[PDB]
Design an enzyme around this catalytic site. Structure first.
Site, PDB file in Angstrom:
ATOM      1  N   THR A 209       3.442   0.910  -4.674  1.00  0.00           N
ATOM      2  CA  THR A 209       3.872  -0.172  -5.631  1.00  0.00           C
ATOM      3  C   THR A 209       3.353  -0.008  -7.325  1.00  0.00           C
ATOM      4  O   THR A 209       4.125  -0.015  -8.151  1.00  0.00           O
ATOM      5  CB  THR A 209       3.498  -1.495  -5.136  1.00  0.00           C
ATOM      6  OG1 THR A 209       3.544  -1.710  -3.667  1.00  0.00           O
ATOM      7  CG2 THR A 209       4.485  -2.622  -5.712  1.00  0.00           C
TER       8      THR A 209
ATOM      9  N   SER B 192      -5.204   2.486   4.349  1.00  0.00           N
ATOM     10  CA  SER B 192      -5.144   1.891   2.978  1.00  0.00           C
ATOM     11  C   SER B 192      -5.183   0.357   3.066  1.00  0.00           C
ATOM     12  O   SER B 192      -5.750  -0.273   2.316  1.00  0.00           O
ATOM     13  CB  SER B 192      -3.727   2.162   2.075  1.00  0.00           C
ATOM     14  OG  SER B 192      -3.851   1.590   0.674  1.00  0.00           O
TER      15      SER B 192
ATOM     16  N   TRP C 101       1.599   2.304  -8.624  1.00  0.00           N
ATOM     17  CA  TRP C 101       1.885   3.629  -9.184  1.00  0.00           C
ATOM     18  C   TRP C 101       3.385   3.902  -9.618  1.00  0.00           C
ATOM     19  O   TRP C 101       3.616   4.137 -10.906  1.00  0.00           O
ATOM     20  CB  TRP C 101       2.126   4.803  -8.043  1.00  0.00           C
ATOM     21  CG  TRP C 101       2.142   6.277  -8.286  1.00  0.00           C
ATOM     22  CD1 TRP C 101       2.010   6.630  -9.554  1.00  0.00           C
ATOM     23  CD2 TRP C 101       1.857   7.305  -7.528  1.00  0.00           C
ATOM     24  NE1 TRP C 101       2.116   8.244  -9.587  1.00  0.00           N
ATOM     25  CE2 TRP C 101       1.802   8.546  -8.406  1.00  0.00           C
ATOM     26  CE3 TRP C 101       2.049   7.472  -5.983  1.00  0.00           C
ATOM     27  CZ2 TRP C 101       1.889   9.809  -7.977  1.00  0.00           C
ATOM     28  CZ3 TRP C 101       1.728   8.798  -5.704  1.00  0.00           C
ATOM     29  CH2 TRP C 101       1.808   9.883  -6.458  1.00  0.00           C
TER      30      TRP C 101
ATOM     31  N   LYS D 266       0.640  -1.098  -0.099  1.00  0.00           N
ATOM     32  CA  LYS D 266       0.052   0.211  -0.159  1.00  0.00           C
ATOM     33  C   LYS D 266       1.032   1.531  -0.043  1.00  0.00           C
ATOM     34  O   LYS D 266       0.442   2.222   0.424  1.00  0.00           O
ATOM     35  CB  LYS D 266      -0.957   0.212   1.318  1.00  0.00           C
ATOM     36  CG  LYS D 266      -1.914  -1.208   1.323  1.00  0.00           C
ATOM     37  CD  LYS D 266      -2.240  -2.033   0.129  1.00  0.00           C
ATOM     38  CE  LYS D 266      -3.272  -1.279  -0.658  1.00  0.00           C
ATOM     39  NZ  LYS D 266      -3.533  -1.963  -1.819  1.00  0.00           N
TER      40      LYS D 266
ATOM     41  N   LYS E 169       8.409  -6.875  -9.110  1.00  0.00           N
ATOM     42  CA  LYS E 169       7.729  -6.339  -7.917  1.00  0.00           C
ATOM     43  C   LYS E 169       7.872  -7.337  -6.675  1.00  0.00           C
ATOM     44  O   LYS E 169       7.772  -8.632  -6.906  1.00  0.00           O
ATOM     45  CB  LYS E 169       6.146  -6.201  -7.942  1.00  0.00           C
ATOM     46  CG  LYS E 169       5.149  -6.124  -6.720  1.00  0.00           C
ATOM     47  CD  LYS E 169       3.634  -6.085  -7.013  1.00  0.00           C
ATOM     48  CE  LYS E 169       3.062  -5.929  -5.656  1.00  0.00           C
ATOM     49  NZ  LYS E 169       1.491  -5.573  -6.007  1.00  0.00           N
TER      50      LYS E 169
ATOM     51  N   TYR F 250       6.391   8.187  -1.164  1.00  0.00           N
ATOM     52  CA  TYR F 250       4.795   8.401  -1.728  1.00  0.00           C
ATOM     53  C   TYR F 250       4.627   9.984  -1.735  1.00  0.00           C
ATOM     54  O   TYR F 250       3.989  10.377  -2.666  1.00  0.00           O
ATOM     55  CB  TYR F 250       3.671   7.480  -1.113  1.00  0.00           C
ATOM     56  CG  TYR F 250       2.398   7.527  -1.582  1.00  0.00           C
ATOM     57  CD1 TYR F 250       2.013   6.738  -2.390  1.00  0.00           C
ATOM     58  CD2 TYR F 250       1.657   8.576  -1.304  1.00  0.00           C
ATOM     59  CE1 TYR F 250       0.773   6.748  -2.928  1.00  0.00           C
ATOM     60  CE2 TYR F 250       0.334   8.897  -1.473  1.00  0.00           C
ATOM     61  CZ  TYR F 250      -0.039   7.994  -2.387  1.00  0.00           C
ATOM     62  OH  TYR F 250      -1.547   8.220  -2.981  1.00  0.00           O
TER      63      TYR F 250
ATOM     64  N   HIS G 191       6.987  -7.328  -1.872  1.00  0.00           N
ATOM     65  CA  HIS G 191       6.867  -6.799  -0.742  1.00  0.00           C
ATOM     66  C   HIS G 191       7.806  -7.299   0.579  1.00  0.00           C
ATOM     67  O   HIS G 191       7.656  -6.959   1.549  1.00  0.00           O
ATOM     68  CB  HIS G 191       5.387  -6.968  -0.193  1.00  0.00           C
ATOM     69  CG  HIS G 191       4.578  -6.345  -1.057  1.00  0.00           C
ATOM     70  ND1 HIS G 191       4.618  -5.099  -1.522  1.00  0.00           N
ATOM     71  CD2 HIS G 191       3.254  -6.670  -1.568  1.00  0.00           C
ATOM     72  CE1 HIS G 191       3.416  -4.779  -2.358  1.00  0.00           C
ATOM     73  NE2 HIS G 191       2.753  -5.572  -2.465  1.00  0.00           N
TER      74      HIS G 191
ATOM     75  N   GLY H  41      -6.302   7.756  -3.457  1.00  0.00           N
ATOM     76  CA  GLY H  41      -4.764   8.236  -3.935  1.00  0.00           C
ATOM     77  C   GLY H  41      -4.322   9.657  -3.239  1.00  0.00           C
ATOM     78  O   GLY H  41      -3.579  10.465  -4.130  1.00  0.00           O
TER      79      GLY H  41
HETATM   80  N1  LIG Z   1      -1.105   6.970  -9.761  1.00  0.00           N
HETATM   81  C1  LIG Z   1      -1.203   7.394  -8.434  1.00  0.00           C
HETATM   82  N2  LIG Z   1      -1.280   8.182  -7.291  1.00  0.00           N
HETATM   83  C2  LIG Z   1      -1.469   8.542  -6.020  1.00  0.00           C
HETATM   84  N3  LIG Z   1      -1.819   7.257  -5.534  1.00  0.00           N
HETATM   85  C3  LIG Z   1      -1.992   6.151  -6.188  1.00  0.00           C
HETATM   86  C4  LIG Z   1      -1.574   5.889  -7.719  1.00  0.00           C
HETATM   87  N4  LIG Z   1      -2.047   4.726  -7.886  1.00  0.00           N
HETATM   88  C5  LIG Z   1      -2.422   4.042  -6.800  1.00  0.00           C
HETATM   89  N5  LIG Z   1      -2.349   4.940  -5.649  1.00  0.00           N
HETATM   90  C6  LIG Z   1      -2.618   4.519  -4.278  1.00  0.00           C
HETATM   91  O1  LIG Z   1      -1.396   3.718  -3.874  1.00  0.00           O
HETATM   92  C7  LIG Z   1      -2.284   2.762  -2.817  1.00  0.00           C
HETATM   93  C8  LIG Z   1      -2.106   1.331  -3.230  1.00  0.00           C
HETATM   94  O2  LIG Z   1      -0.562   0.907  -3.109  1.00  0.00           O
HETATM   95  P1  LIG Z   1       0.255  -0.400  -3.626  1.00  0.00           P
HETATM   96  O3  LIG Z   1       0.005  -0.144  -5.313  1.00  0.00           O
HETATM   97  O4  LIG Z   1       1.442  -0.369  -3.050  1.00  0.00           O
HETATM   98  O5  LIG Z   1      -0.660  -1.217  -3.248  1.00  0.00           O
HETATM   99  S1  LIG Z   1      -0.205  -3.033  -3.291  1.00  0.00           S
HETATM  100  O6  LIG Z   1       1.083  -2.956  -2.217  1.00  0.00           O
HETATM  101  O7  LIG Z   1       0.571  -3.184  -4.581  1.00  0.00           O
HETATM  102  O8  LIG Z   1      -1.174  -4.065  -3.011  1.00  0.00           O
HETATM  103  C9  LIG Z   1      -3.963   3.211  -2.778  1.00  0.00           C
HETATM  104  O9  LIG Z   1      -4.010   4.227  -1.873  1.00  0.00           O
HETATM  105  P2  LIG Z   1      -5.226   4.548  -0.909  1.00  0.00           P
HETATM  106  O10 LIG Z   1      -6.063   5.293  -2.004  1.00  0.00           O
HETATM  107  O11 LIG Z   1      -4.632   5.480   0.073  1.00  0.00           O
HETATM  108  O12 LIG Z   1      -5.678   3.324  -0.614  1.00  0.00           O
HETATM  109  C10 LIG Z   1      -4.061   3.665  -4.017  1.00  0.00           C
HETATM  110  O13 LIG Z   1      -5.005   4.622  -4.327  1.00  0.00           O
HETATM  111  O1  LIG Z   2      -4.214 -10.061  -3.743  1.00  0.00           O
HETATM  112  N1  LIG Z   2      -3.538  -9.663  -2.908  1.00  0.00           N
HETATM  113  O2  LIG Z   2      -3.595 -10.276  -1.814  1.00  0.00           O
HETATM  114  C1  LIG Z   2      -2.488  -8.743  -3.016  1.00  0.00           C
HETATM  115  C2  LIG Z   2      -2.315  -8.166  -4.216  1.00  0.00           C
HETATM  116  C3  LIG Z   2      -1.322  -7.228  -4.490  1.00  0.00           C
HETATM  117  C4  LIG Z   2      -0.656  -6.864  -3.164  1.00  0.00           C
HETATM  118  O3  LIG Z   2       0.410  -5.789  -3.465  1.00  0.00           O
HETATM  119  C5  LIG Z   2      -0.646  -7.305  -2.169  1.00  0.00           C
HETATM  120  C6  LIG Z   2      -1.568  -8.417  -1.893  1.00  0.00           C
END
Ligand SMILES: Nc1ncnc2c1ncn2[C@@H]1O[C@H](COP(=O)(O)OS(=O)(=O)O)[C@@H](OP(=O)(O)O)[C@H]1O
Ligand SMILES: O=[N+]([O-])c1ccc(O)cc1
Ligand SMILES: O=[N+]([O-])c1ccc(O)cc1
Length: 289
Positions: free
Chosen positions: A46, A133, A48, A43, A101, A188, A103, A254
């Site tokens: 990643t 998030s 982005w 969250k 990718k 971020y 984590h 976001g």
């Molecule tokens: N382009 C862009 N700009 C700003 N913010 C963005 C963008 N793309 C994804 N997001 C926000 O990033 C959060 C998801 O993070 P991850 O992509 O790391 O999630 S994951 O770990 O890959 O599952 C999640 O944050 P929250 O909105 O706070 O839940 C997304 O909305």
């Molecule tokens: O589906 N999933 O459980 C997820 C998918 C993406 C991620 O970055 C972490 C967990």
């Protein structure tokens, strides 16, 4: 039922049951010298940064970046779920240069990345926004255990009893690692404030010089309002069984500072007291707004 199971300890860290079950396949992963590893605590931006990197590799060409969903373009390495996905095999069959990718906490990263001296882009995000998030994500992304109530989830997060372990150790150890390996350590909140500047940092790190026009194209297509509606980037191509967007959309808000909408004042004060204690051994500094 592959969904909603309890996490399983892997070398000290709670991971999805199916990752633990196939751990030897992850630890023996074969990296390549020109792999770019995107590494984040969940969250933290990643998707982005993965979209930004794929746009860079494709010269800002939006159609080329729609060839497949982000989770196929930039495979989640350790994510192996029988009948559903295998990040290791996806990457094994992918032509170089690969965008990878993960984590994984530093101590769990497959050693091949270190042996190949790969460039790594780490993205960190302020803990309060991460936990909010992650709470909504736990609800929508069914591979996770039930998060419980916000209050219960908040406590689990502070205790590191969540998928991929404690945020505090994740960001701190990855920060320390920047002294040993080529890690561009991004925030971020900086990407929110000045995306152009951060993408310029990525380009310099990648040793690429591109025209201002292409840079602006990359900026436009990596914006939240474009990515949120982009089916190739917004996870809506996932089956509802894996991710239910009617519960909470992947592209949720976001912004920076959504923690203010979720935390009670008491939860905030308690979280901060705990945070200072966990983070004073580190030169790492964050902004929460
Ligand atoms: N382009 C862009 N700009 C700003 N913010 C963005 C963008 N793309 C994804 N997001 C926000 O990033 C959060 C998801 O993070 P991850 O992509 O790391 O999630 S994951 O770990 O890959 O599952 C999640 O944050 P929250 O909105 O706070 O839940 C997304 O909305
Ligand atoms: O589906 N999933 O459980 C997820 C998918 C993406 C991620 O970055 C972490 C967990
Ligand atoms: O099926 N899933 O839940 C997935 C599959 C792939 C991925 O990258 C994230 C989640």
């Amino acid at each position: 039922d592959v969904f909603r199971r309890e996490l399983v300890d892997v070398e000290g860290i709670p991971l999805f049951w199916s990752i633990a079950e196939h751990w030897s396949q992850v630890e023996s992963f074969e990296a390549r010298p020109d792999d770019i590893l995107i590494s984040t605590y969940p969250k933290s931006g990643t998707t982005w940064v993965s979209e930004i990197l794929d746009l860079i590799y494709n010269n800002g060409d939006a159609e080329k970046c729609k060839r497949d969903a982000i989770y196929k373009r930039v495979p989640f390495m350790e994510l192996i779920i029988p009948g559903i996905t295998n990040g290791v095999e996806m990457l094994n069959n992918m032509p170089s240069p690969r965008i990878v990718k993960t984590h994984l906490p530093v101590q769990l990263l497959p050693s091949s990345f270190w042996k190949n001296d790969c460039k790594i882009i780490y993205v960190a995000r302020n803990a309060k926004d991460v936990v909010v998030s992650y709470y909504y994500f736990y609800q929508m992304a069914k591979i996770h255990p039930e998060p419980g109530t916000w209050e219960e989830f908040l406590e689990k997060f502070m205790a590191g009893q969540v998928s991929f372990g404690p945020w505090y150790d994740h960001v701190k150890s990855w920060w320390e690692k920047r002294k040993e390996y080529r890690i561009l350590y991004l925030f971020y909140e900086d990407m929110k404030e000045n995306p152009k500047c951060e993408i310029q940092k990525i380009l310099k790190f990648l040793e690429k010089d591109i025209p201002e026009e292409i840079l602006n194209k990359i900026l436009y297509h990596s914006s939240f309002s474009v990515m949120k509606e982009n089916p190739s980037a917004n996870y809506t191509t996932m089956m509802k069984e894996e991710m239910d967007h009617s519960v909470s959309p992947f592209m949720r808000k976001g912004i920076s500072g959504d923690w203010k909408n979720q935390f009670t004042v008491a939860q905030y004060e308690k979280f901060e007291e705990d945070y200072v204690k966990k983070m004073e051994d580190s030169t790492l500094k964050f902004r929460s707004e």
